[PDB]
Design a protein around this nucleic acid. Structure first.
Ligand SMILES: [Mg+2]
Ligand SMILES: [Mg+2]
Ligand SMILES: [Mg+2]
Ligand SMILES: [Mg+2]
Ligand SMILES: [Mg+2]
Ligand SMILES: [Mg+2]
Ligand SMILES: [Mg+2]
Ligand SMILES: [Mg+2]
Ligand SMILES: [Mg+2]
Ligand SMILES: [Mg+2]
Ligand SMILES: [Mg+2]
Ligand SMILES: [Mg+2]
Ligand SMILES: [Mg+2]
Ligand SMILES: [Mg+2]
Ligand SMILES: [Mg+2]
Ligand SMILES: [Mg+2]
Ligand SMILES: [Mg+2]
Ligand SMILES: [Mg+2]
Ligand SMILES: [Mg+2]
Ligand SMILES: [Mg+2]
Ligand SMILES: [Mg+2]
Ligand SMILES: [Mg+2]
Ligand code: NA
Ligand code: NA
Ligand code: NA
Ligand code: NA
Lengths: 150, 107
RNA sequence: AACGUGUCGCGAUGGAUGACUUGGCUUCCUAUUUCGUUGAAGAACGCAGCAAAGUGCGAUAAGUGGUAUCAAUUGCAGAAUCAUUGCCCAAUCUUUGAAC
RNA sequence: GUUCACCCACUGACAGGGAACGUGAGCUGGGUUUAGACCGUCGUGAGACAGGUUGGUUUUACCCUACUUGGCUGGAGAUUG
RNA sequence: CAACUGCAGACCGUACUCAUCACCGCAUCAGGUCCCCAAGCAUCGAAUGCUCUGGUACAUAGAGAAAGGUACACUCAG
RNA sequence: AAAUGGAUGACGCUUAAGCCCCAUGUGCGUGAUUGCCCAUUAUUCCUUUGGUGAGGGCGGCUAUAUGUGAGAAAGUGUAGCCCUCCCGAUGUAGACGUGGCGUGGGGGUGAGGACGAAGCCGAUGGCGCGAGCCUCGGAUGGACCCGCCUCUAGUGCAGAUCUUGGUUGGCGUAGCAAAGAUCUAACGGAAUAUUUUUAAAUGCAACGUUGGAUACUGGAGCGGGGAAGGAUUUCGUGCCAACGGCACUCGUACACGAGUUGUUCGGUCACUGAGCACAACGUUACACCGUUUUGUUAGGAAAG
RNA sequence: GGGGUGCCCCCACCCGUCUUGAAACACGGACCAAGGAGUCAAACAGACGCGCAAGGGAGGAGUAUUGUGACAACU
RNA sequence: UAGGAAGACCGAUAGCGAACAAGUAGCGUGAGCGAAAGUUUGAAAAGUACUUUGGAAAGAGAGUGACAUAGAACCUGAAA
C-alpha cells in the first residue's frame, strides 16, 4: 500500500491485482468514491447501474458524449461503465467483511486512499489491409483501498 | 600480431648490471618496500653450510637468525584475493615479493 | 472552478547495471591412432512400475556377461556380494541404407 | 480540350485585371506526357518526329490552427495585498 | 469326368471433414477448389418468385427522424 | 494609376518633435579653452593564463620547552620552491602541447571490507576554468574492492531514413454496418428479487436447454455421400485460466478416458497407354551423359 | 555561504549538416537502456629516446637447466 | 579416436548460430534459411498448516525464515 493508515486498529484494507477491466474506465469509477462513506459509495454504484446518476470522466474524457447527469459533479462529460462498477462493488464487499472480522462498524467507515495502477498487458492481433498485422492489446489494472472508522 | 620483442644483447647485460648495483644500496632497498631493519651488512653474505639443510624447520631458524623473517612475514600478511575478472582466469590470489637467495647451482 | 504545469515522499511498469560462470575462443603436447559386403555413415520405428522431450539401448531393448570396489538408488513406489558406480574381453543387435 | 477568336439572340450593359498564371486530401480528366497499335516523312537498322490518330488505376484527415455552429466555468494587484 | 460332401479361405485401407469454421490464401478471410443423387405450383423453363422433407436463426448489440454520405431503393409541376 | 488592412519603427508633431545653418555647467554681447546619454574601444585598479620573458633569495649560529607560528625543493611541466616587474590573450578547416580527466586487464607497492564490498538513488554539500574527484544520507544492497608508479587495449556517443529490446501521445479515438430476425414461459447456473445510511423513482446487462410462436435456406440448398488436402477435428464425462476481435453456463478450446472388425467393398496379387530408364554398348579428363516400342536391348553365344 | 520553488525589470530565432550564404517554405530529427566507426602486418623516410661505433646486429639452430621454465642464461 | 597443458582473451545484445530437451522450435514446393531463452528463491523447501470473506481467482489475519519489499521465471532492481 502506498499510504499508511493513521490508526491501524480501526482500518480495513482490500486489494485486487490484474483485474480484467479497462484501466481507464476503472480509474474514473474508483476515483469518485474517495472521501465518501461506505454506504454512500455503495448507493451511488447502485444508482449508476439503474442509470439515474453517472460517473464523471475527468482525465480520460477524450471525445466522449455530454449528459445532464454530469452537472452534479460540476462538469458535462460522464458515462455508465457497467463492468467497472460491478467489479468495484465486489471489492467493497470484501473490505466490509474484513472490518467485521476486526469488530468495527461498517456503517461508520469512511473511504480513504483509492489508487488505480496499470497492470502488465495481454497481446492479441488483428488483420489489416494489404497483408498487415497490428497489435490488439488489453489493459488490466490493479486496485487498492482502505477505510477508517472516525 | 607482433607478440614478442628483440633486445640488443649488450643492453640486456647493462640492465642486469645496473639492477645488481641498485640492490647494494640500503636506501634504494627500503624505498622499494623491503623490511631490512634487522639485517646487518647489506649486501648480506652467509656461509655455505646453508646448502646442506634438509628440513624446512632448519631453514626457518636460519631466516630468523639473520633477520630476513620480517620480509617473509610481510609477504604472508599481504596474501589476498585479486580484484576484478582476473580471479576467474586462474590467477585468484596476489602476494608481494620477498627476499632472494642466490646459490652457486641447483643443489 | 475544473483541465493542464512544476517540486518532493511512497507505489506500479520494465528488465538495465554490478557481482557470479560445469560455456566459448586461441595456442601447445602425447599415443600399441584412422570406417565399410564379417553390411558403414545416415534415416525410420520401438524399449522404464508410474516416462512428453532429451539420454542409453534393440523383442536378451534406461539393458545380459566379465572385472575392481562395497551399500546404496532416491520424486513416489518397490526389492534387499547381488545391486549401483567405473572400465572391458563374451553376446544380443527390429525396418532400411553402398543395399546386392 | 482549349485560353483566345468568330457567329446567333437578349439587355441599361453584356469593362479589364489580381489573389502560388486563386482554387485536384473540392470535383472532372477533354488536352499534355509511359507501356499496346496504325499512317506520313526520316534512318541500312534498332529506332526518331514540339507531325496526325485510337485505347489507357486520380490514394489518406480521427492531429494543430482557421472558419461554422454547440455547451461548462473563473476572473478588478485580470486568479495574490 | 460331371454331382454331392468335409475342411480352409492370406495382406493393407475403413473414425471424421470435404468448406460463408476441418483444404490453399500469415486467420473460423464476401477470394479459389473435381464427382454423384435433386420434390410441388406459376411458367417455354435447371430463368425468376413462393412452399412439404432435410437443415438453420450463426455472423457485436440497444436507443434512435442532425449535417454530409453509400444503396443489388423511389417519386416529382412546366 | 493596382490588386489581404498598414506603416518617417509606432504614437504623434506645425511659437515643430519639419528643412538649412549657429551655440553650451553654475550667470549666453561681465567667469576665453568638457551641456548630457549609451560599447567586449581607451586610461586605471584587481585576478587568471602563456611567454624569444626581465630581475632577486636559496653555505639556514639571534634568542627562545609546554600547560608571534608556519614554510623555503638549484627548479620545463604538480597543491606550480618563493617574491617583484613587463608584454600578449577571440577564431572555422588544420597542426601541436598538457607530473591533463575517465574505462577493462598485467607487473610492483600500500591499504579497505559482515561494526557491511561493488552496484543503485539524491533540494548531500565541498573542491577544480573544465573533463571530473571526494565526503554525507539511504527507513538501499549483501560480497568483494581501491590509492600511487609503470605496461597494455575490442578504452569515453545525441543524431548515421543506425542495430536490438522497452515505453509512448494520437486514444477509450477510427471503428467492430454484404449474406433480412428474433419473441415468450419454465428450468440450469455464483452470475439474484444483492438497500439499514410499503410496491416504481437504489443490482443493470448478458448465457444454455426444453415447450410454444415467428421466420430464412428453397433440391445449381447453411441437404445426403466421395477424390485432392488435412490427420483425431469423431464419442462420452468433466471443465471456463488463455482462445473463438461482443458474450458464453456453449465449443472443431482445455483435461481424462474410448472408438475404425471384410473369402465377395477399394488397392496389391494379375493388364496394357502417353511415357520412364536397370542391364548391355558407346562417349566423356571425369558418368552425375546418350540409346533403350516404327516389333521391341546388346558385333549380339542373354531360352535351364 | 550553498541548494529548491515562484515573481519582477532587462536580454535571448532550432539543433546536426552540405553551402558564397540556414531561424528557414533545404535534408536528418517521438522517448529511454545497452551496443556503434583510423585497427593489425609488411617496405621506406623524417623528428625524438637508448646501446655500441669503423664497425653494428642477427636469424635459423645448438649447449646447459616443475623449477616465476613457451621465460631467463650461454654459443 | 583417447588423453593432457594452458591464456596480459570474451563474460549472457559479448564469446561458436547454440553457457538452457540448438542445427532445436519455426519458415519455404524445393535447393535451403534458422531463433529467443542464465530456473541466479533460500545455507537449508523450512515452498505459507490453520481462521475468516469469496463460485473460483484472490483479499484480510496467522506462521517459516537473519531478511517474504527473498513467495516461485522469486539476487540486485536503473531510465523512459
Ligand atoms: Mg481487418
Ligand atoms: Mg492475405
Ligand atoms: Mg487545395
Ligand atoms: Mg526506308
Ligand atoms: Mg460434398
Ligand atoms: Mg471462405
Ligand atoms: Mg399451365
Ligand atoms: Mg425453377
Ligand atoms: Mg436458379
Ligand atoms: Mg419533371
Ligand atoms: Mg585560442
Ligand atoms: Mg577488454
Ligand atoms: Mg546510449
Ligand atoms: Mg465510436
Ligand atoms: Mg423463402
Ligand atoms: Mg448442397
Ligand atoms: Mg471474445
Ligand atoms: Mg546553393
Ligand atoms: Mg542551421
Ligand atoms: Mg523561406
Ligand atoms: Mg548468444
Ligand atoms: Mg545468437
Ligand atoms: Na569492477
Ligand atoms: Na526612428
Ligand atoms: Na510404351
Ligand atoms: Na541530401
Amino acid at each position: 500500500y502506498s499510504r499508511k493508515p493513521q490508526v491501524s486498529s480501526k482500518t480495513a484494507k482490500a486489494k485486487i491485482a490484474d483485474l480484467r477491466c479497462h484501466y481507464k474506465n476503472t480509474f474514473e469509477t474508483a476515483n469518485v468514491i474517495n472521501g465518501m462513506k461506505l454506504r454512500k459509495a455503495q448507493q451511488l454504484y447502485r444508482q449508476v447501474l439503474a442509470k439515474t446518476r453517472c460517473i464523471p470522466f475527468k482525465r480520460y474524457n477524450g471525445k466522449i458524449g455530454n449528459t445532464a447527469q454530469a452537472k452534479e459533479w460540476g462538469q458535462t462529460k460522464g458515462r455508465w461503465p457497467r463492468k467497472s462498477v460491478v467489479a468495484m462493488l465486489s471489492l467493497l464487499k470484501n473490505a466490509e467483511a474484513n472490518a467485521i472480522e476486526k469488530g468495527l462498524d461498517p456503517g461508520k467507515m469512511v473511504i480513504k486512499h483509492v489508487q488505480v495502477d496499470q497492470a502488465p498487458r495481454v497481446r492479441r492481433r488483428t488483420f489489416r489491409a494489404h497483408g498487415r498485422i497490428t497489435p490488439y492489446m488489453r489493459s488490466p489494472c490493479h486496485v487498492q483501498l482502505f477505510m477508517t472508522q472516525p | 600480431r607482433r607478440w614478442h620483442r628483440k633486445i640488443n644483447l649488450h643492453q640486456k647485460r647493462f640492465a642486469v648490471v645496473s639492477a645488481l648495483a641498485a640492490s647494494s644500496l640500503p636506501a634504494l632497498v627500503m624505498s622499494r618496500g623491503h623490511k631490512i631493519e634487522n639485517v646487518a651488512e647489506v649486501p648480506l653474505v652467509v656461509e655455505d653450510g646453508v646448502r646442506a639443510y634438509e628440513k624446512t624447520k632448519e631453514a626457518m631458524t636460519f631466516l630468523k637468525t639473520v633477520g630476513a623473517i620480517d620480509d617473509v612475514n610481510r609477504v604472508n600478511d599481504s596474501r589476498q584475493i585479486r580484484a576484478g575478472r582476473g580471479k576467474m582466469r586462474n590467477r585468484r590470489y596476489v602476494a608481494r615479493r620477498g627476499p632472494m637467495l642466490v646459490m652457486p647451482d641447483n643443489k
